[PDB]
Ligand binder design. Structure first.
Ligand SMILES: [Co+2]
Ligand SMILES: [Co+2]
Lengths: 234, 232
């Protein structure tokens, strides 16, 4: 069907390596990226810490698994993935597709720092959180912002779902695309997600616009997600 | 201020009068219809029974409060309201706006009739339920069909929210309320809503297309809603 990009990190305590997974497909099913689509993920996923952006390495039984170079202390970090810009033809016209994913990882049951996670990373279409997902109970408001080319993106629809919401009769041709939240961004680009359950959540946004250089391509489509945790697994 | 149209019903046991309300504004705050938009609601709300559609009586303190002419027996009915077609200029082109609202009313406890609540009443854009909400608990799929001009509508975004989900912004931004559900219809216009908390629920779908007679108006917009209850 349709393929979107997201990131998922396993529960990590202090002193360990950070195991992360790049999902290209239908959330939340992790699946290996096909050989004809290996070139669209040219660069490895990055990990954001107090020192900056670090390249992760690809190690595991499947090609979507990554681990950090060195173990990290307790804290709260981001892990980002990118679908490299590619060109396609539709009907006819050219269109450049790009996709982005960012996951908030809280290593340690006590850390909920906001210094690293709230700073934008430079994704063309980016969802920047303004709080820590661990500070939000069910029913509270999780305030985030939507940026496009650096500036805020007003009047942009942000939806959100979680693992376990849409599950009935799913297969290759059924969606499990039902969302547990939907709203629009204000003039400052901000919006508040309201989670009614606990688990692993993904908030999605998209933006189709005109390509800057019309002598090369005409349209542009960006699909961005942000993944986090509501509640506590351990 | 968006000003969307929906409907609301009170706790009614079989035998007494059916008192309903027409909301024209931001859900769920009821507010009287201003004098400059009375003409858009020239036709009163209708109530459907086994006897068919019957008009209601706009009697009460405010001009949005309606009462049933005939006391109703126990069962399951629908109450409908219409924002009549108006023309506006946008940019420069013409757009015809029509809006609709429908409420499932279960009068009397243990009322789960589906004889008439699942029948299309004939709204240009319509949200026809395929189940009684009283039989739907928390976390259970509620299958609804979306009709446009009689035939189903595929790939239409249906959202749903409930009273108490969003508690902010009385008139600061006047933007749309936060939704607690969002999905799209399949090839037969069907979609399953998943209510995660008990309360007074309202679902919405909108459709913007061309106008049939291009020598009169160019565009057309329809905003249709469906209100019901999930426990208490
Ligand atoms: Co633990
Ligand atoms: Co009672």
């Amino acid at each position: 069907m349709v393929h979107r990009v997201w990131v998922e990190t396993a529960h990590t305590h202090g002193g360990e390596y950070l195991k992360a997974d790049l999902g290209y497909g239908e959330f939340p099913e992790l699946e290996p990226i096909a050989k004809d689509r290996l070139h669209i993920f040219s660069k490895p996923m990055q990990l954001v810490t107090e020192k900056g952006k670090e390249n992760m390495i690809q190690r595991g039984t499947y090609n979507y698994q990554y681990r950090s170079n060195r173990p990290v202390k307790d804290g709260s970090y981001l892990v980002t993935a990118e679908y490299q810009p590619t060109f396609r033809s539709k009907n006819s016209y050219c269109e450049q597709t790009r996709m982005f994913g960012k996951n908030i990882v809280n290593v340690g049951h006590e850390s909920a720092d906001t210094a690293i996670i709230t700073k934008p990373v430079g994704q063309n279409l980016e969802i920047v959180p303004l709080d820590n997902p661990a500070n939000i109970h069910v029913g509270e408001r999780f305030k985030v912002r939507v940026l496009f080319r650096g500036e805020p993106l007003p009047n942009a629809t942000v939806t959100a779902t979680f693992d376990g919401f849409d599950t009935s009769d799913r297969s290759k041709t059924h969606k499990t695309e039902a969302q547990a939240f939907s709203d629009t961004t204000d003039g400052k680009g901000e919006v508040d997600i309201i989670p009614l359950r606990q688990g692993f959540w993904k908030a999605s946004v998209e933006y189709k616009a005109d390509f800057p250089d019309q002598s090369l391509c005409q349209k542009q489509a960006n699909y961005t997600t942000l993944t986090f945790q509501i509640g506590h697994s351990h």
